[PDB]
Structure formats: C-alpha cells, structure tokens
Amino acid sequence: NPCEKHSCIAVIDAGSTGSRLHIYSYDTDDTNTPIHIEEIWNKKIKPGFASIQPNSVTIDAYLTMLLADAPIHNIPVYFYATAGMRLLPQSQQKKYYDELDYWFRQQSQWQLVEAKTITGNDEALFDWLAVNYKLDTLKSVQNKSVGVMDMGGASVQIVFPMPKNAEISKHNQVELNIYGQNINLYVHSFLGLGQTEMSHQFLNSPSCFANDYPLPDGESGQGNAPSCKEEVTSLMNSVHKVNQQIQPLLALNPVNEWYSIGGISNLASSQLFHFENSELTNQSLLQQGDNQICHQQWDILNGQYPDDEYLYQYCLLSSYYYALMVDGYGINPNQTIHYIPPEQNLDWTIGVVLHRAL
Amino acid sequence: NPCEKHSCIAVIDAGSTGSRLHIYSYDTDDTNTPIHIEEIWNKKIKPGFASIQPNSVTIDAYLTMLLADAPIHNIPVYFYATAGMRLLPQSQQKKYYDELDYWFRQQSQWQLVEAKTITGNDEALFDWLAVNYKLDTLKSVQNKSVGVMDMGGASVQIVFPMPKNAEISKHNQVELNIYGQNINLYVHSFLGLGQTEMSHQFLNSPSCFANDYPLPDGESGQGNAPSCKEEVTSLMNSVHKVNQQIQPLLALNPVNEWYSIGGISNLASSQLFHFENSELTNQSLLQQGDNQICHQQWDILNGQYPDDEYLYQYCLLSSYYYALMVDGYGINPNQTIHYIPPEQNLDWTIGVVLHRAL
Numbered sequence: 086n087p088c089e090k091h092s093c094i095a096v097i098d099a100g101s102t103g104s105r106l107h108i109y110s111y112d113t114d115d116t117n118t119p120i121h122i123e124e125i126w127n128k129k130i131k132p133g134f135a136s137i138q139p140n141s142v143t144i145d146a147y148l149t150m151l152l153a154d155a156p157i158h159n160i161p162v163y164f165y166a167t168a169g170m171r172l173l174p175q176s177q178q179k180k181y182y183d184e185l186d187y188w189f190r191q192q193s194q195w196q197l198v199e200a201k202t203i204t205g206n207d208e209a210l211f212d213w214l215a216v217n218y219k220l221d222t223l224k225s226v227q228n229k230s231v232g233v234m235d236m237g238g239a240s241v242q243i244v245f246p247m248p249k250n251a252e253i254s255k256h257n258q259v260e261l262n263i264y265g266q267n268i269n270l271y272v273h274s275f276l277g278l279g280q281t282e283m284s285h286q287f288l289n290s291p292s293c294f295a296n297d298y299p300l301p302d303g304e305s306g307q308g309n310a311p312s313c314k315e316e317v318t319s320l321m322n323s324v325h326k327v328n329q330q331i332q333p334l335l336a337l338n339p340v341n342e343w344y345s346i347g348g349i350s351n352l353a354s355s356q357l358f359h360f361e362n363s364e365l366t367n368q369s370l371l372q373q374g375d376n377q378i379c380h381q382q383w384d385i386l387n388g389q390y391p392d393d394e395y396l397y398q399y400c401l402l403s404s405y406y407y408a409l410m411v412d413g414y415g416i417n418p419n420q421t422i423h424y425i426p427p428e429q430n431l432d433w434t435i436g437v438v439l440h441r442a443l
Numbered sequence: 444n445p446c447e448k449h450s451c452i453a454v455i456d457a458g459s460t461g462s463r464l465h466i467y468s469y470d471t472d473d474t475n476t477p478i479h480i481e482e483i484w485n486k487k488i489k490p491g492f493a494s495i496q497p498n499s500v501t502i503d504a505y506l507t508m509l510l511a512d513a514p515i516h517n518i519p520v521y522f523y524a525t526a527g528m529r530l531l532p533q534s535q536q537k538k539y540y541d542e543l544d545y546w547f548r549q550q551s552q553w554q555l556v557e558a559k560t561i562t563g564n565d566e567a568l569f570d571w572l573a574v575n576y577k578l579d580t581l582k583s584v585q586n587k588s589v590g591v592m593d594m595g596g597a598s599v600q601i602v603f604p605m606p607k608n609a610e611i612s613k614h615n616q617v618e619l620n621i622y623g624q625n626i627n628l629y630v631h632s633f634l635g636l637g638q639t640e641m642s643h644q645f646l647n648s649p650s651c652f653a654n655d656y657p658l659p660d661g662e663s664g665q666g667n668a669p670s671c672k673e674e675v676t677s678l679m680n681s682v683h684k685v686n687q688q689i690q691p692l693l694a695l696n697p698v699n700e701w702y703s704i705g706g707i708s709n710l711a712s713s714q715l716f717h718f719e720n721s722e723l724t725n726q727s728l729l730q731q732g733d734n735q736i737c738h739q740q741w742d743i744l745n746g747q748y749p750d751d752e753y754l755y756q757y758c759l760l761s762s763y764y765y766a767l768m769v770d771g772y773g774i775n776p777n778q779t780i781h782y783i784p785p786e787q788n789l790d791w792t793i794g795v796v797l798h799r800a801l
C-alpha cells in the first residue's frame with residue numbers, strides 16, 4: 086500500500102503507437118523535489134490515442150481499458166500526448182481533449198490534473214530527465230556529458246548538455262536547476278522522422294526489404310542495407326536538414342555517453358539481433374541488419390522467426406537508425422550506444438514527476 | 444429499380460481518408476463490354492477502412508454505416524482498397540479482410556465478389572479508364588493524348604499513353620483492348636506522396652503555413668509558397684526521384700490534355716481559390732496559395748473563413764501540387780490542368796465496371 090505512505094501520481098504517455106499509464110510512488114527532499122521514485126503500476130494499450138475516432142463512446146472504451154484495473158485509483162493524473170497528436174491541427178485535437186475531460190468527470194476516483202499535447206522540445210527535456218534520473222547522474226555535477234535519443238513512431242528526440250547560446254532558438258534550449266545543480270540542455274524533436282512516418286516513404290524501396298518480400302506496388306524486395314540507408318539519409322538530410330542542425334552543436338559540445346530509448350530498445354533486444362551489455366554500435370547494427378534480414382529470402386526468414394510482427398521491417402529499421410545517428414547526428418559508427426532494456430518500462434514520464442516540482 | 448432491367452454492380456473505393464460506395468447500372472455492347480454506365484447510388488463515410496481497429500464490432504459498425512440504407516441491394520459487390528491499406532503489411536491487412544469476409548457471409552442483401560487491396564498501378568489504370576469513359580474518348584481512336592493524375596491521401600498516380608516498351612518494368616505498363624481499340628498506358632503510383640503522408644514531413648516548416656500559424660513544435664508560420672514548394676520538391680525528387688522517373692517518359696510521349704481527380708478538385712473548388720471552367724494552371728495555383736493563404740495572418744484568415752477544415756493546409760497544398768506537377772512531373776507552369784468537379788463523384792471505380800470484361 087505505497088500511496089498511504091508516499092506521494093503518488095499517475096502519468097500517461099499517450100504516444101503515437103499506444104498509451105502507457107504509470108503510477109509512481111515517491112518521497113521528496115528538503116526543496117519538495119521528488120526522490121526514491123518507484124513505478125508501482127504500469128499498463129500499456131494500443132493503438133495511439135490520436136488514431137481513434139474522437140467521440141463519446143470510443144474515448145470511454147479506450148480510457149476504461151487504460152485505467153479500470155489500476156490497483157489504486159484516488160490519485161492525481163497527468164495525461165500528456167506526444168507526436169501522434171502533434172500530427173493533428175489544434176481544432177481537431179480539441180475534440181479528443183473535450184471528450185477526455187468529460188470521461189474523468191463521470192467518475193470520482195481519478196483526479197485529472199492536466200491532459201494536453203506537449204511539444205517535442207518538452208518531450209526531449211523529459212526524455213533527458215528520465216534517463217539521467219535512472220542513471221543517478223542528476224544529484225551531483227557530472228564530469229561527463231550524457232546525451233539521450235528517443236526513437237518514437239512519429240518523432241525522434243535528441244537532447245544533450247549545451248551552454249546557453251543566444252544564436253539558437255530559445256525553443257531548443259532549456260535551463261533547469263535540480264537537486265541544487267544548474268543544467269543547460271539543447272533539445273530537438275524531428276516530427277515525421279519517427280519509425281512509422283518515415284517508413285511510409287520507403288515501402289516500395291526494394292533495398293529496404295528482404296529478398297522476395299512482396300512490396301505493396303508489386304515489385305520484390307532485394308535488400309541491401311547500405312543502399313537502403315542512403316535512401317533514408319536523403320529524407321534525414323535533404324529534407325529535414327538533420328546534419329546541418331545537429332552536427333555543429335555536437336562538434337562543439339561532445340557527448341561522452343549516449344543512451345537511447347524507444348523502438349531501438351525493442352529491435353536490439355529481439356531474437357534477430359545480438360548485442361551484449363544492453364549496448365550497440367551503429368556499425369554492428371547495420372551489418373547485422375544487412376546479413377540477418379536484408380540479404381535473406383523473405384519466406385524462409387518469416388518461417389524461421391514466426392513470433393515477431395516487426396520482422397519484415399528490420400532491414401529498413403537497421404538502415405534507418407544508422408542513417409539517423411551516423412549520417413544525421415554525425416555520431417561515429419563505432420561509438421557505443423546504450424539502450425535501456427524494454428522490460429524496464431522507461432519512457433519520459435519520470436521526467437514529469439521531477440520537472441513539475443522545479 | 445433499374446437493376447431489374449439493367450446489369451448492376453456495387454464498387455467501393457476504400458481510400459486512405461474514407462470509403463465511397465457507388466452502385467452502377469449499365470448495359471453491354473456485343474462483346475459484353477459495359478455501356479451507358481450510370482451511378483444510381485453513392486454513399487461516402489469516414490475515416491479510411493485501414494484506420495479502424497479490425498474486429499467484429501468495429502467492422503460491422505463501419506460496413507453497416509456504408510451499406511445499410513442503399514435503396515438497392517441483391518447485387519454483386521467489389522471492395523477495393525487503395526493506399527491506406529498499402530501502408531500495412533499483408534499480415535495486418537489479412538485481419539481486416541477476414542472480418543470483412545465474415546460480415547458479408549453473415550448477411551444476404553449483398554453478394555461479395557472480391558475484397559482486396561489493389562496496387563497503385565491497378566488504381567492508376569482505373570483512374571485513366573474512369574476519366575476517359577466520362578470524356579467519351581474510349582470508343583474511337585484519338586489524335587490527342589490524355590494524361591490523368593489522381594491526388595490521394597497516401598499515394599498519387601499518374602497515367603498516360605505510352606507504346607509498349609521492353610526497357611520499362613512490366614508493372615508500369617498496361618495494354619488493354621476496349622471497344623475494339625488497343626491502348627497502351629504507362630502507370631505509376633507514388634506511395635508516401637499523397638497529401639496526408641507528405642504533409643507529415645513539413646508540419647514544422649514555417650514557409651508552409653500562414654503567418655503566425657502555431658506550428659506543433661512551438662515556432663510560428665511565416666508563409667512563402669515558393670519556399671514551401673522547394674522544401675516539398677526535396678521529398679519529390681531527392682527522396683522519390685519523381686523527376687528522374689517521369690520526365691524522360693513525358694518528353695518522349697507528350698500529353699496533350701491533363702485531367703486531375705482527388706484532393707486538388709476540392710481545393711480548386713473551395714472558397715479560397717478562384718478558377719473558371721473547372722481548370723487551373725500551376726502558375727496560378729501557386730500565386731493564389733502564396734497571396735491568399737501563405738502571406739496572410741493566421742488568426743485573421745481563420746476568422747474570415749470558419750467553415751473550411753482544410754484552410755490551415757492550403758499554403759502547403761498549393762505548394763505541394765506545384766512541386767509534384769511542375770518539379771516532379773515536368774509539367775509547364777502555364778499548362779492547363781482540368782480538374783473534375785467534386786460534385787460529380789468521379790473516382791476510379793467506373794474503371795472497375797469496364798475492366799473486368801477486358
């Protein structure tokens with residue numbers, strides 16, 4: 086019974102591919118900042134909140150599925166949506182939040198505090214705080230710079246320490262003081278470069294799929310990860326200018342340790358890829374995708390690995406993470422990238438627990 | 444009931460943003476080819492079939508909404524999905540068709556003949572047949588080349604006469620004999636270049652939205668249609684290589700008359716754009732988007748035109764159409780593009796009526 090003995094709050098991550106409810110217990114320090122944060126309940130549902138029809142009945146069914154069986158009810162709730170809602174204009178988002186408001190009113194258990202769409206810059210800030218909280222690097226001044234990448238379905242975030250730079254948009258910088266230390270971060274979010282959204286530009290690229298994979302417009306896969314990666318790079322850099330925006334800031338503000346969350350954790354953890362110590366390199370990721378998926382015969386590979394719904398996309402995703410990290414951000418292909426094990430349930434929502442007290 | 448005296452079939456265009464049921468009555472000529480095709484019923488619903496969750500209740504609700512009030516039944520039904528379903532792997536699509544098949548087997552007003560996702564090349568063939576059926580150019584050999592463009596939510600098609608060519612993929616060429624004439628067409632569909640998918644790459648481009656439009660990541664619009672157009676061109680050409688694929692073939696097989704269907708018809712017929720004779724030029728489209736939407740103050744313009752859900756996108760759409768047609772396909776900016784009025788309910792489904800028999 087942790088909430089009779091500690092502060093508890095519920096935070097919902099309403100992401101593009103699904104929603105995750107977390108209930109956290111915590112204590113606070115002499116400034117009322119959260120410490121000893123523990124997840125006491127987790128429930129994840131699909132699909133994305135923004136993908137459902139915005140009406141009375143659909144929203145009731147969704148929230149009921151997300152929330153009903155939660156072992157404790159009478160606590161404060163934060164519902165924060167990310168890139169799936171950001172694909173919609175505010176006028177269309179309002180329908181969702183109007184219905185969501187009404188639902189929390191028909192019940193007297195949950196105490197809805199806020200429900201809104203957060204910007205990609207806020208999501209990146211919470212990404213950094215959540216990871217660094219878990220690493221225990223917040224309470225003392227660090228010798229080393231820790232960067233975080235979050236690989237989502239409709240957006241990707243990157244976030245790292247950088248002193249205030251009045252040449253760069255205020256939207257891409259954040260200054261916080263936490264646990265008595267002053268931290269300055271660069272934040273950026275690329276909407277359209279998440280997994281789902283970017284995949285929709287390459288479904289008819291034979292280099293991006295296993296041999297003989299049936300592409301939608303009737304051609305056959307003929308995988309080749311270096312080729313697929315160059316196609317993805319054109320979207321990263323010719324369209325979004327990822328390189329031009331990010332590389333000069335990392336040159337001048339190098340990151341010593343990189344951590345990633347989001348889909349890359351699942352792929353790295355899957356039966357198809359082999360990585361030690363919950364870390365990878367981009368070079369090993371591209372070579373493994375090239376040999377274990379791109380250059381395999383699809384029907385054979387599909388039969389060997391029956392229980393993985395993302396299997397058909399692994400040539401593409403391997404290629405895409407390499408294009409993003411190496412050709413986009415400029416990270417060296419042999420640089421270690423730590424990824425958080427998916428079983429740990431780490432998303433940015435611990436960031437909300439902390440930042441609201443700051 | 445016309446179907447007691449004429450052949451009737453139902454064809455459903457299951458597109459990315461909605462499904463449209465059409466019931467056609469027709470007679471046949473001496474070769475059993477349809478003539479005198481008349482739409483006797485139309486019903487359109489949203490959202491797209493691929494956007495719903497696939498289970499018994501949801502598909503029943505969707506199919507009931509689409510079909511249940513048709514004045515005529517006891518007829519064959521063809522359900523053909525397009526790019527919305529093409530975004531999904533066959534394993535996910537299969538769930539939708541298994542539930543759809545069951546729904547039809549559980550009733551007796553409709554005789555399902557086929558329910559399947561068609562390729563964008565099939566969709567392009569049907570786009571050309573539907574338009575030329577309505578122009579009455581199919582019964583006699585033409586001394587004018589007619590090209591057809593279909594602007595969808597997830598793909599765009601282009602299709603035009605081109606003699607059979609051993610160097611072009613067979614998948615991009617179609618030969619058919621109709622009404623005693625032999626017609627060879629080049630077909631192409633670009634998955635990811637439809638309006639909805641494209642627009643997801645540019646939601647944070649200030650050049651693509653009216654002044655001060657709130658972009659999702661917190662920057663402000665600062666519209667400029669030529670600048671937006673150049674951004675969209677990088678998707679067209681640096682990613683999809685539209686120019687390299689299409690321009691050489693139009694150079695060798697010039698089109699005399701261009702017809703467009705899909706979203707452009709709605710935009711051009713809206714209260715914000717002014718065109719006569721159901722035709723436009725790319726030069727005028729880009730000018731009108733630039734001056735009438737891009738360079739306006741968002742809140743002022745939104746207050747002036749409350750009744751149009753697409754208004755916020757019109758700076759981006761005018762620029763995207765120009766990027767697609769001018770920079771992608773090579774069409775001269777002063778060349779007339781005819782658009783079928785939206786009231787006419789012309790989509791490619793008339794092609795299905797004709798094509799079966801050939």
Ligand SMILES: [Mg+2]
Nearest residue numbers: 100101167237
């Ligand atoms: Mg996420």
Ligand SMILES: [Mg+2]
Nearest residue numbers: 458459525595
């Ligand atoms: Mg369509």
Ligand code: NA
Nearest residue numbers: 282285640643
């Ligand atoms: Na997309």
